[PDB]
Amino acid sequence: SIEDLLARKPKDLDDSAVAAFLKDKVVLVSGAGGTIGSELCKQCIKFGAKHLIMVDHSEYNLYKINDDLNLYKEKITPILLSILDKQSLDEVLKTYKPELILHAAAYKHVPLCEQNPHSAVINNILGTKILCDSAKENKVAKFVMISTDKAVRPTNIMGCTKRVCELYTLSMSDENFEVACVRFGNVLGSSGSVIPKFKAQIANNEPLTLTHPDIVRYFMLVAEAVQLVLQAGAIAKGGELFVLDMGKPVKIIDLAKKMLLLSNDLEIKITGLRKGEKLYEELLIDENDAKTQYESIFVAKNEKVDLDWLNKEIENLQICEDISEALLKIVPEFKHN
Amino acid sequence: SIEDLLARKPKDLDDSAVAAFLKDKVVLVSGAGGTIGSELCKQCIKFGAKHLIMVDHSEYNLYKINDDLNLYKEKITPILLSILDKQSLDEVLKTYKPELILHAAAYKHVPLCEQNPHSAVINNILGTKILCDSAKENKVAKFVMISTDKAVRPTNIMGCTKRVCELYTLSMSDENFEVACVRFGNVLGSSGSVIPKFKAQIANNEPLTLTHPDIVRYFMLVAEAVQLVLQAGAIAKGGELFVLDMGKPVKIIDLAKKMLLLSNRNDLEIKITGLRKGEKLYEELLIDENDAKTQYESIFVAKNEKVDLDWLNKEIENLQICEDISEALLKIVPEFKHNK
Ligand SMILES: NC(=O)c1ccc[n+]([C@@H]2O[C@H](COP(=O)([O-])OP(=O)(O)OC[C@H]3O[C@@H](n4cnc5c(N)ncnc54)[C@H](O)[C@@H]3O)[C@@H](O)[C@H]2O)c1
Ligand SMILES: NC(=O)c1ccc[n+]([C@@H]2O[C@H](COP(=O)([O-])OP(=O)(O)OC[C@H]3O[C@@H](n4cnc5c(N)ncnc54)[C@H](O)[C@@H]3O)[C@@H](O)[C@H]2O)c1
Ligand SMILES: O=c1ccn([C@@H]2O[C@H](COP(=O)(O)OP(=O)(O)O)[C@@H](O)[C@H]2O)c(=O)[nH]1
Ligand SMILES: O=c1ccn([C@@H]2O[C@H](COP(=O)(O)OP(=O)(O)O)[C@@H](O)[C@H]2O)c(=O)[nH]1
Ligand code: NA
């Protein structure tokens, strides 16, 4: 199988550490029905969370994760809710008092975010602000945000918004409220990602659509990335930007060709780079990143920004005419393509 | 397959009528990536809409319908938006000036809406008010709302919210702004519906979970139900509550049996799990003996009286603040009998 062939198989998965971090906690997962969120949920159960609160605005996704976890229904609360609804969210936090928030709600599709930049701003930046602010006010002990390699030297709106989320959450970290962000790259087989698409095209006797002959991504299984996220959250003291070692880059052409050989004839058609799309995402581990006890996990450097400043910029982002230009002022390494 | 066996095969599908209604229109579909919405989008393309504006708050669903329709990318605009965001929504309508809105955005799962009644109120009732109000202020000519047989003498939160939506939209209808609501029953193969549930249970060698041995639902293929919706919309003059003829009801037990038979796997037992809160054994038959006929044998007009919007807007505000949503709904919808 292709997923097998591309799995990382990190040597440093540590079940008992994550169990030690999660046992008997009240954990809330935002975007609980998403690719990342659903797996966060499954692992929270696996590693012994006492109560899992599942927040998602997509009814099918909340339904699906709730139904998937039906054997543990007595430990789970499905909360059908947008994290933009401050008042309802504050109520959820007051009532359940979670000790840990795993924040996996966002918009992530680069093209749809180039087409809908204001919604990417609201959903990603303003949603993260509201959830993070409400977590801190309601004495949540620890807050872990999912980030992405597309947040590093971002060339798209999506990625730049997640970079602003890193800046915000990490700047809210203090002795009482420990925030960590974790960057990682592509997850194998997430819905509406390149692999099931190729599998479909192959099953429909269609040509495989390849963006560019040279395009490469880094890949991990979802269970691999999520367990490493949780190990990172376990060791965090607050303020860390973590980065996962994704292993070898994979050329998407080679991925196409392996999938063809795997089903024993169709042509691969080149369709062109898309706006804001990178030929090679940034390698996540810098040579000056600090090591942790886990070989797959490093801590990248980050400075706090002034929150009065950053809040004003976030206010302005909601009303401004040129979102791209506003984002550059906040994220100077943003080179918008 | 089961789908074929339970397909309505309505004798009165009219392609040329639908084309005449949609040809060269700017049409906006809310919940564009949903089960019903996505089929609405497809048929807008099929029947010659000039420009389809696809509104949905679920990024994957929006992505998927957009991709599904990539051969028509130049005629579609994917708008990643919640209809609760009035100011972004007003600007969408000011920009694209749709002539028709097909409103297929809602929350529909009865158990989730029992557990999240406030979200059901906000997403369904408040989302419908905002979209409808904005459509009317922006001189959209016609507004069609997707409703449900669960809105008829509702016993659940979800169904009751949809009833309120019917009241609001229909009461908004006037000589400039033509509203139609269309009620129909279950769509075969829908998102999170019983048939995929049974398929996944068989795939993992588990027993089939059947709520109750006597439970029945009415069914239709999604393309049938949606083309009939659009035919209703085409003949609407504003104010009509339409109802579809769903044919013969289906006992879910027979469906479960058939699916077991059809994958040869009668090794599997059928465990009875029990009727859920809010859940009906038998949904209401949609056509009343006094409903009016149309030229389509599968579509009738049910009676409705406008309510006063000053009253209805006041109750809608109360729903957002009240202690007891069930009790507040009952004031708006006298026939609401909440099952716990
Ligand atoms: N999928 C990947 O390969 C991948 C890899 C690395 C990083 N990430 C990052 O992880 C994050 C999550 O992405 P994903 O792949 O799980 O996407 P997803 O769309 O599958 O999941 C996101 C979930 O969040 C929910 N959601 C979105 N906005 C919400 C809101 N305002 N309120 C409540 N719920 C909301 C969605 O309904 C969905 O279920 C993104 O920031 C993405 O960049 C994803
Ligand atoms: N599926 C059925 O069998 C069936 C039958 C009759 C009537 N209906 C009715 O049709 C409506 C939709 O049903 P469905 O089966 O399509 O559900 P769905 O969940 O499959 O589709 C709804 C779509 O609307 C979107 N949405 C929800 N809230 C939104 C918001 N605030 N802004 C933007 N988009 C939003 C969702 O993301 C989704 O893509 C419901 O009112 C339901 O009762 C469904
Ligand atoms: O039809 C496709 C879809 C994707 N890709 C490439 O495969 C990689 C993974 O795409 P995906 O959408 O899976 O995730 P993204 O990195 O886009 O978040 C990227 O280099 C894409 O350009 C491709 O070549 N053909
Ligand atoms: O696991 C299930 C799910 C549903 N049903 C029954 O099958 C019918 C279809 O339910 P569905 O959720 O598909 O849609 P609903 O009628 O609930 O909107 C209903 O009478 C349910 O009680 C069932 O027996 N087992
Ligand atoms: Na261990």
Ligand code: NA
């Ligand atoms: Na539960």
